[PDB]
């Protein structure tokens, strides 16, 4: 197993471990270069595609996957996430060992890259053969192989860029950076796009601010121009951007919440300090997990309805009508798009709110149990550091953590779900999922910045 795959592990390229720690300014520069490369690849279409007119059942796995259909980033960050969860499950099921020796973790990284590349090849083959990019029989072996090679090398670039970020050149991981970059790109596009669409009422810009300026300059600077620019229905609004800024501000405010535990040291005396237990204890993992669950359920419902239509169970799981849920569990798990949608079906809005809050709370608690951030898992860190709580005994470190951390995780789940629901209700551009992910990732970057400043 490990012995026979180690020579297969070493073939893949690896990022050189930096000789000296990289400062924050040029860390930001390298992160900007990495996201620029990812964005440029997101715009270049694959070669050999005859038709991009298909179903694309994973349309909702695009904000959390940083995927753009038909381009070099067809798969987005799916190889990285798949390899990460595969390795975490393998380590937790004791087939392999991450270890602590540099050789052990180097082999772990090499095998993670190997499994990510295997997943990349598998996804590319599935995408090619299952009818996307055109008929695989019509494209031929040469075109199908060329598309598979393009997707393979694009995935190799994604893993290389993520490894570049993680080895110390960037500000985090490829997953968070690419997700936040896609969300911010979407919001800025819907704010400032020069794209124009004509529906019989002349030229009309697709970006909100550009449409505002165009209308104010053209239509006699009328109050009707401002009313349309703020309450436009066929294109992005100015009220949608105002609600996006408002949700940004509120999520920032609630991301700044923390429970500051006064901790001292019983090993190195004089190391008074603070342990911040954030209200958003699991930063955006509830969003990622909830979006993945809902989107996977959507894919399952679409697959069942397409093949096994008419069955009562399939209809209850979801009714579809491009597609969007119209009935069933998939509908009740779908955000109400407009205020009129909320008004016509209050029951759907209530069920969506309850499901979002409960799922976010459940995923937050499950993640603090899984990822090693449980109260017991933090009490182990307190014990094997000499750290105790200032006004509490050393034998009571776990009980205070048991009081704080589970409640912090659950209520962070509720707060995050409520923020996403509020953003979805207000019509915020970027959506609740996108806005929350973007704010949490930029806050991770900001907290890395303040950590580096404190180290100075």
């Amino acid at each position: 197993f490990l012995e026979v795959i180690k020579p297969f592990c070493v073939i893949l390229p690896e990022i050189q471990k930096p000789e000296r720690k990289i400062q924050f300014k040029e860390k930001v520069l390298w992160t900007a270069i990495t996201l620029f490369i990812f964005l440029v690849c997101c715009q270049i279409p694959l070669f050999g595609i005859m038709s991009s007119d298909s179903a694309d059942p994973f349309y909702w796995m695009r904000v959390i996957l940083a995927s753009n259909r038909g381009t070099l980033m067809e798969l987005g960050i799916s190889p990285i996430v798949t390899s990460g969860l595969i390795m975490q499950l393998l380590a937790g099921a004791k087939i392999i060992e991450v270890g602590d020796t540099p050789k052990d973790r180097a082999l772990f990284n090499g095998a993670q890259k190997l499994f990510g590349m295997i997943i990349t090849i598998g996804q590319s083959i599935v995408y090619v053969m299952t009818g996307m990019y055109g008929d695989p029989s019509e494209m031929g072996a040469g075109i199908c192989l060329l598309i598979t090679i393009q997707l393979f090398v694009a995935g190799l670039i994604v893993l290389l860029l993520d490894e570049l970020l993680q080895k110390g050149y960037g500000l985090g991981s490829g997953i968070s950076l690419f997700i936040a970059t896609n969300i911010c790109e979407t919001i800025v596009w819907k704010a400032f796009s020069p794209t124009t669409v004509n529906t019989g009422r002349g030229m009309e810009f697709e970006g909100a601010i550009i449409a505002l300026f165009h209308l104010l300059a053209t239509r006699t600077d009328k109050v009707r121009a401002l009313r349309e620019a703020f309450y436009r229905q066929n294109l992005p609004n100015l009220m949608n951007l105002i609600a996006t800024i408002f949700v940004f501000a509120v999520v920032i405010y609630f991301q700044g919440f923390r429970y500051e535990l006064p901790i001292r040291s019983t090993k190195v005396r004089g190391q008074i300090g603070i342990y911040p237990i954030k209200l958003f204890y699991t930063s955006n993992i509830p969003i990622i997990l909830q979006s993945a669950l809902v989107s996977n359920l959507y894919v399952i419902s679409q697959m069942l309805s397409a093949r096994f239509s008419g069955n009562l169970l399939v209809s209850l799981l979801g009714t579809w009508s491009r597609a969007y849920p119209v009935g069933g569990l998939c509908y009740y798990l779908s955000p109400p798009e407009s205020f009129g949608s909320v008004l016509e079906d209050p029951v759907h809005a209530v069920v969506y709110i309850v499901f979002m809050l409960g799922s976010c709370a459940f995923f937050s608690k499950t993640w603090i149990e899984v990822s090693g951030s449980s109260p017991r898992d933090i009490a182990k860190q307190f014990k094997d550091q000499g750290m105790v709580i200032n006004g509490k005994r050393e034998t009571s470190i776990y009980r205070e953590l048991k009081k704080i951390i589970p409640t912090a995780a659950a209520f962070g789940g509720l707060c995050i779900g409520a923020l996403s629901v509020l953003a979805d209700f207000l019509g915020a551009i970027g959506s609740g999922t996108g806005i929350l992910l973007a704010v949490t990732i930029i806050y991770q970057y900001f907290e890395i910045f303040v950590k580096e400043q404190s180290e100075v």
Binding site: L65, S78, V81, T82, V126, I288, Q290, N296, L297
Partner: peptide, 10 residues
């Protein structure tokens, strides 16, 4: 593939 909170299209 759609199994689950996993994210591995198709």
């Amino acid at each position: 593939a759609x199994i689950x909170x996993x994210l591995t299209x198709l």
